[PDB]
Amino acid sequence: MTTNYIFVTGGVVSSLGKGIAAASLAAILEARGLNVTIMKLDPYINVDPGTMSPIQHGEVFVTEDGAETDLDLGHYERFIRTKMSRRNNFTTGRIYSDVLRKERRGDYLGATVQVIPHITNAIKERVLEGGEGHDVVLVEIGGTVGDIESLPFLEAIRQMAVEIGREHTLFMHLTLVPYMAASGEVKTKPTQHSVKELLSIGIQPDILICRSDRAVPANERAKIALFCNVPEKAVISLKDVDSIYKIPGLLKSQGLDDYICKRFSLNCPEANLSEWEQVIFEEANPVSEVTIGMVGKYIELPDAYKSVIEALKHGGLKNRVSVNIKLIDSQDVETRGVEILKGLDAILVPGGFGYRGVEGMITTARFARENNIPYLGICLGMQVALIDYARHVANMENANSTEFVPDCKYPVVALITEWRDENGNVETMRLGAQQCQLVDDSLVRQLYNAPTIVERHRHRYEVNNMLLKQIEDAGLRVAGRSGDDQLVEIIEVPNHPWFVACQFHPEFTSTPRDGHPLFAGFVKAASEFQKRQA
């Protein structure tokens, strides 16, 4: 058994969906019965993604082993059943940190540490590490070809291609074949140049991917084949589609995987695309529909709440109901007011960091609570809901979080060390999948059908138990607590049709095939309420 590698690059423009393409391929090769894995090389200087905001790159993926990483690692989880780890993704900054530390420790024995060969060796080692024991390793190269931001990686690859041997490596490259309406046709010139750029750095493409909003004519594919030194059969067209789960079908349709096994000589098992067929069937045969408002801050870029959006979708799939998300700026709730929240079947408040429109978020929580409108709060949404209830029911004037106000007077949220009461009497970040203790008498315990659950976290502040008894005794249900210090994990409203909120991130566990009890209940409640109001 010898590991085979396929490198995935792309040029001309960004935003082509390199990770999507790679993931779809992996799904097929999985369906061919191969031991497929995948890694992504991140050109950024940031060592860890935790040093960047949600608005900067969208959601940060949490791996099983607790590592924080590129969102695309979650995308990989949605196409292949293998598990990602810290070994599946690292950054440029990470590399330098490691190398410089080795230098400091005398690891290079007085030698000059140079990009070539030392930085590239660091890269080479990491690649071999992650691909160890696998049949096929896909490697996504971030950045854009021709930019200096990733040339070191491209060089390391070239070296490995030579050292390993061409019989175990392929070069896949994404391009853009844009449609020029003024001319009434697509152009190939950009592609031709993109390939030339790879060639100038020692890389000859084997497989071409033509991204566009429409199928590229065979004639044009042939023209490309000519200029790029690539067989026509290896020039794959990839038009835009309305679902990433249809891509495996397209790649299979054009014989991509067969080519690879012949190279690529692979004994690939018959593709099991029935999962996609199911999705298609359900898509093409809806029965209801509900409208769910999403009040937040980063709504100007859907990607910021991508994992949430998909979790909602999955709940809808299980209940055969369309999910219509209304994006709402919490700051507009502060300006315009609750009129925004009208015409909704359910209310949802996502997590995140930053104050901005948080008071409007509270107003919304209040609105949904007081008007009995199916409410779901996550992380920050829970913090908000806590304040809402506390201030307007438990009478905790200015209930707040110490992350925004040093002297809240009624710090309902604070660091455990910072826990204190309204009289000033007292007494890092929770990450990854953690076990939570559910209250047997709670709704969510029964939704999960289990005494305890394990769910992912990403936050530093906690419910201030010094003032919890005020809130809870006022008439609020704690549906779950955590571990050692029984930190509040889930809250339910005693007489609200469906109002829940939690500390964990259920949106990182939800799948299209399994769904997720919480979102199933939420979306269902939306429907129930909709009918209740009709």
Next chain:
Amino acid sequence: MTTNYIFVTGGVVSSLGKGIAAASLAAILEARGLNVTIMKLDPYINVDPGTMSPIQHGEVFVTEDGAETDLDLGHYERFIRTKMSRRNNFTTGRIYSDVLRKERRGDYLGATVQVIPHITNAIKERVLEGGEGHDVVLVEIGGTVGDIESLPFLEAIRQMAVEIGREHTLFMHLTLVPYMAASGEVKTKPTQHSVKELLSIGIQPDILICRSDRAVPANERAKIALFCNVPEKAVISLKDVDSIYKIPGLLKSQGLDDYICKRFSLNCPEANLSEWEQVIFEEANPVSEVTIGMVGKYIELPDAYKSVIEALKHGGLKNRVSVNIKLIDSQDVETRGVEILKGLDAILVPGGFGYRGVEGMITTARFARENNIPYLGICLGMQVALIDYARHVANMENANSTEFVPDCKYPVVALITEWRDENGNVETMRLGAQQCQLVDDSLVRQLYNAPTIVERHRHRYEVNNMLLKQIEDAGLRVAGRSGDDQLVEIIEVPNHPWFVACQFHPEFTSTPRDGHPLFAGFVKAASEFQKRQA
């Protein structure tokens, strides 16, 4: 008075409309009271455009001095009142022909002839020639930046610019700021790279043109300004529009010309944009509409019949009537038949070269003639009509052209030398504006209101006078004859509502403001016939 120059380049993709942008600018500069002219340099090896087909590059422009040249010079004359002479356009091959000839005759005295400096000097000298006596000279560089096809020219410019000084030169550069619907936004990266490419060959852009299908946000323009070393006000946005005549307005709106005179310190007279204001009014307030069929061969690319389409538009403007053109493949008329020609108010048959389905063109001519449907024939279309009438009225068995069948038996079209009768008894290319004697009693004479006219030509074969008397005596009007040998120029059908066909190319002389008698009459007839058939 010292001549100022502005160079126009473009990159990322082809087909951005460099000629359009340049012409629009020139129009404004003329409107500012400046002696502005324009030249275009081509990256083609073809010495003359006469060696290429209409399908290859579209219509070939006919200049006043008889030179055959780039179509864009027609566009240049449609915006400024100066004339596009042979000095206003030349190719790469042209240059080499000249230089090699100079070498052959000893003009380089035993020296090595090199791109640098000899080819670049040849280019430079031609530019200086054309720019003589002008205030502002625009120079359009064909090809795409980064491609080897025009690097010599870019180099020649660099040299020139240095020699004449920056105070007499500006660098304008077109780019693409494509919209990526998947991201929901436009991208600037391609532009940044395009500029870097010019810089790598010694050229620093002064003015940027952002081509797109929508206005580019000031923020994005600022980002570009940053990365390109260009002032924000010199970054011009240019969204797609439905008419070239609206571009001067846009460029003026963004202050482009003011910048230039400040650089450009120009004492520019108030722009006279009333010509387009007129057009806008008429466009916005049409009174009728007609449908006119166009039977030909190169209909897969409208540009092939561009000048014709424009002329038709001009007839429509004068008659306040919309002109709906139906493109028809002559091979389909040949195959499917005259059913194609139904539902039309008028029939038009354009000129060109190639057999393909010319028999179907003849069928169409017959159809329009026999059914009295407003017919207009141009160049070849006249030859087609000649055959039609001859064979089916004058009983000229297989009336035809010797260019396809030497032994026609009734060679109605042949070279003057080749003129012969049906018994075999006997006895280059006509180019440019030539005087034609109109028959005072013809309609066309009265349409022009003149004894004679001067119109442009482009053909080799003539009406075979050996058999003309057969055709003419059968009942057909020769509405005009040339000069020297009174060659048949225009034919009219005695009892047809509006049947005119001619050897010359009226489409190269019409304007949107002056119109053109033949299209005025033709389109009017279409309307009359439309009402007749109702």
Next chain:
Amino acid sequence: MTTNYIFVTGGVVSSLGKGIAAASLAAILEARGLNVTIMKLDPYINVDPGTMSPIQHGEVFVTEDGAETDLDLGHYERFIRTKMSRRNNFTTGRIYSDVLRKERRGDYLGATVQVIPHITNAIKERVLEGGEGHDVVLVEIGGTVGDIESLPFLEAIRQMAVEIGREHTLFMHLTLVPYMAASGEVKTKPTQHSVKELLSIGIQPDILICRSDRAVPANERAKIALFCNVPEKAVISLKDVDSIYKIPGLLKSQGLDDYICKRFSLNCPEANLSEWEQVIFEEANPVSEVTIGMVGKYIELPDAYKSVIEALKHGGLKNRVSVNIKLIDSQDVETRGVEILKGLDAILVPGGFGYRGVEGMITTARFARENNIPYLGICLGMQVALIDYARHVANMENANSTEFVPDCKYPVVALITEWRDENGNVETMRLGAQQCQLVDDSLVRQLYNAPTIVERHRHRYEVNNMLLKQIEDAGLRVAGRSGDDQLVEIIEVPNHPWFVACQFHPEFTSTPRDGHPLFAGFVKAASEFQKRQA
């Protein structure tokens, strides 16, 4: 039998001896019993080398078939027995001439003629033509890698290589490993970059040639091997030597040919290096010595008279005598006078073009003649001697050539058409090997031992028969006449110890193993004179 190809390129700096290296290799391949040939592509606009001066590029080689070509073709003749032809050498300009002509006559049927693919087609077809029927074909690419002057050729090659497969092609690249005395060591960086440049245009080197003034250390060769993706054994060191004839030995020493046949898997015959062993023996064991003075014009770059220098050397080899050549400027004899000509054992006057100090050349001819100093005149040197004798012995005041002074009055040299006497009564270029009728009673007839001989030519003006009779009757022996027109091919002075001058070019036939009668005679006479003067 399938033809194998090896391409030769060079980077960093020019003048590394690409032709030398290629010829040396070919010699070895022939020595191994392989059908090897060689071609050279030249990056020049000049169509034919005949349009350039001797001082510009040095001697222009005359091939068997009369083609004028690059000097290096003669160098190829000195290493292998495969005969060169017009198919073995052509220029960039030649290509364009051919292609443009094809365009003109319609060979491209209306298509766009582009560098790619049409210019590259012209190139690759010529390559395949010349390589027909050979086992191994060496192709030398002139110019320097990274320069635009030869990128089209490099591209044509890349394409070809792909088309024929790597099993039939190798890339040999020359570089420079400069010695930096300030550092006390050689550097390799330039080489590393040179290789990178080839890679950027799609070419990966297989064999590296390290030119220097000293052997390159294995360590440095290894460093290069690393950075260039080349096996250590394929990195060849090539230090400067005092004789080209020693290079085959060096290449053989490093196992180059074995590698090639293994690739390169070649059943190569044992190298016969005895030709150089002979030379070495003779070189290291001279017996006499003699001083030869040469008067000319292009002495500022010995390459101009390279073929002559070699021919003199060959005469010396046959007479076991060292040849000491004094370089004399004709303009100095003109200025300083005959004092320059003192201390010489014999005097030689070469051919060429340009009036310059030719009067000093005439003065020299006079000097050698009148002082009985062995003399050898070639082409122009004959014209010079003719004038000398004519003016001073035959009393032909202002004896001269019409090529410099049309109105001579005693045009001893003139175009055959221009032949005339002093009273005005009258009555292109001769090239290649032509038969000359020798006079049986002449020395030259006996030196060659044959009634007639065949020798190469290159000149436009001939001995003026109208006045010849004055010169010949005055006491000058015509040692041989051409043929049809009995043109004075060669003369001898009746009472001069050894004074011979001719129209032909004996220097293009002389070899180190065969020698040549006129140089044997001249050099011997030179020695004899020396001894007579001592």
